Design an enzyme around this catalytic site. Structure first.
Site, short mmCIF file in Angstrom:
data_model
loop_
_atom_site.label_atom_id
_atom_site.label_comp_id
_atom_site.label_asym_id
_atom_site.label_seq_id
_atom_site.Cartn_x
_atom_site.Cartn_y
_atom_site.Cartn_z
N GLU A 120 6.90 1.96 -2.56
CA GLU A 120 6.09 2.35 -1.39
C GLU A 120 5.02 3.35 -1.80
O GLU A 120 3.93 3.36 -1.17
CB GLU A 120 6.99 2.91 -0.30
N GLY A 155 10.22 -7.40 2.13
CA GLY A 155 9.23 -7.61 3.18
C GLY A 155 8.39 -8.85 3.07
O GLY A 155 7.34 -8.92 3.64
N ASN A 171 18.30 6.29 -0.60
CA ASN A 171 16.93 6.70 -0.22
C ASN A 171 16.75 6.57 1.26
O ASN A 171 16.60 5.47 1.80
CB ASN A 171 15.91 5.82 -0.96
N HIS A 185 8.51 5.11 -6.57
CA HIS A 185 8.96 4.10 -5.63
C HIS A 185 7.85 3.16 -5.27
O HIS A 185 6.70 3.55 -5.15
CB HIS A 185 9.53 4.79 -4.39
N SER A 223 17.27 -5.27 -1.83
CA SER A 223 17.90 -4.92 -0.50
C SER A 223 19.45 -5.10 -0.92
O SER A 223 20.03 -6.12 -1.48
CB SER A 223 17.37 -5.87 0.53
N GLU A 240 13.05 -2.46 -8.64
CA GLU A 240 12.78 -2.96 -7.25
C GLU A 240 12.12 -4.31 -7.31
O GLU A 240 11.03 -4.45 -7.78
CB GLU A 240 11.84 -2.00 -6.56
#
Lengths: 254, 254
Positions: A97, A171, A10, A95, A211, A165
């Protein structure tokens, strides 16, 4: 489960004409093992160039999103029908985000998924819980609700890849271990066995979207229920991304 | 005011490879008067093909949206920096379909605009009030708030085109007359004279984004404060769109 082992890159909202050309050339220089599916997801504007220049032997294309329905008066959106007609085989939906910045609800993600599947795409359907949700003791509640929405919309999982995820480890200053990743993937596997049947669950690719780098990919890929990766920033570095694709080992095998 | 007269074609979420190729060939067959600016806005995935095949003599490209900020971890989004680097000169921001379906607020539209201008794009900035707002006697209140947000963010209007969408006359069963359109455009012109100065306001293109066709374009184009159009569905029919571009008359002139 299985597999084929599946790795998606991605690129997120990154690129320039020169950088995309360079990344494509780096990807084309890489060697990928037989029997791994690899997909790369550029921003929409680059899909034509990438489809034309990226080695089809090694890579398939994906989009990073699609509209919830067909063509029409939806300024700024790209439809699944458009993507299929363009020759794109995959789309990422839901996703983290987009669930957060764009308020895509569980139901919206699920409807986007069923619409995309009916238009002929494969879907990398994304789920995952935040740090607040994990802090509150809501991990099962949140993942079950995300999955229940998908199960309500999707009948055929043949062209779905489920991506977990750990948004609690994206973050936040928290790292997810491979053991923590596997614990979730094992939960998801048993959930899917119960909702879909053991044969569907065994064949479903459940890929890890925390990650993932060239540093940690083999520690993750060896986990029993991790069938691949949805890679973020490492996907922008060609040789590092190709290394992640080579983490498959026996899950390729072909 | 003036002008150049400006016509944008918003294709919205429509296209296929074959239909885009056909539309480009129809557009290339058309004759456009000197001194009219014409922009066409395909879905993102087609921008490369259109930029390569559409006559640059006659047409410029636009995108239909852009992200609020620069490159980064914004899956599914395209940035203004990407668009500029790609060679796209324009973007539509704040279209009514995005204010409503995507909840883009007055402030979000304004920040998207200033960001896009700082990245080097021209912006077709869209405003407009709904039927409920017009029913409630809120037309000035709503338009002033939409414009006040834009004025707070934008310093230089040289590369801005303001598009008024009578959203009360889009999908409601209500038609807007040319007189109703001109009444709003005259209001907007005086607002801009007061906020920006009479010289800026006189040069600002205020284009009409209600339902514009080859049937009504000359009745609209003759109105004193209508400097062009943001065309919707008629933009998908090449000869009809070229006719709208020819409605400029003396507002071209060149």
């Amino acid at each position: 489960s299985s597999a084929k082992f599946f790795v998606g890159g991605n690129w997120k909202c990154n690129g320039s004409v020169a950088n995309v050309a360079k990344l494509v050339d780096e990807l084309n220089a890489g060697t990928i093992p037989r029997g791994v599916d690899v997909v790369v997801a550029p921003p929409f504007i680059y899909i034509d160039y990438v489809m034309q220049h990226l080695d089809r032997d090694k890579y398939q294309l994906s989009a990073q999103n699609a509209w919830i329905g067909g063509n029409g008066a939806f300024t700024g959106e790209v439809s699944a029908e458009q993507l299929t007609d363009f020759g794109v085989p995959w789309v990422i939906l839901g996703h983290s985000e987009r669930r957060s910045l764009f308020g895509e609800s569980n139901e919206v993600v699920a409807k986007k998924t069923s619409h995309a599947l009916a238009a002929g795409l494969g879907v990398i359907a994304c789920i995952g819980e935040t740090l607040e949700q994990r802090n509150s003791g809501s991990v099962f509640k949140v993942l079950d609700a995300q999955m229940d929405a998908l199960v309500d919309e999707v009948k055929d999982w043949t062209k779905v890849v489920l991506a977990y995820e750990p948004v609690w480890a994206i973050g936040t200053g928290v790292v997810a271990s491979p053991e923590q990743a596997q614990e979730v993937h094992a939960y998801l596997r048993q959930y899917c066995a119960k909702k879909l049947g053991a044969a569907v669950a065994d064949k479903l690719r459940i890929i890890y979207g925390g990650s993932v780098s060239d540093t940690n990919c083999k520690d993750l890929s060896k986990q029993e229920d991790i069938d691949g990766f949805l890679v973020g920033g490492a996907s922008l570095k060609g040789a590092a991304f190709v290394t992640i694709c080579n983490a498959a080992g026996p899950k390729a095998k072909p």
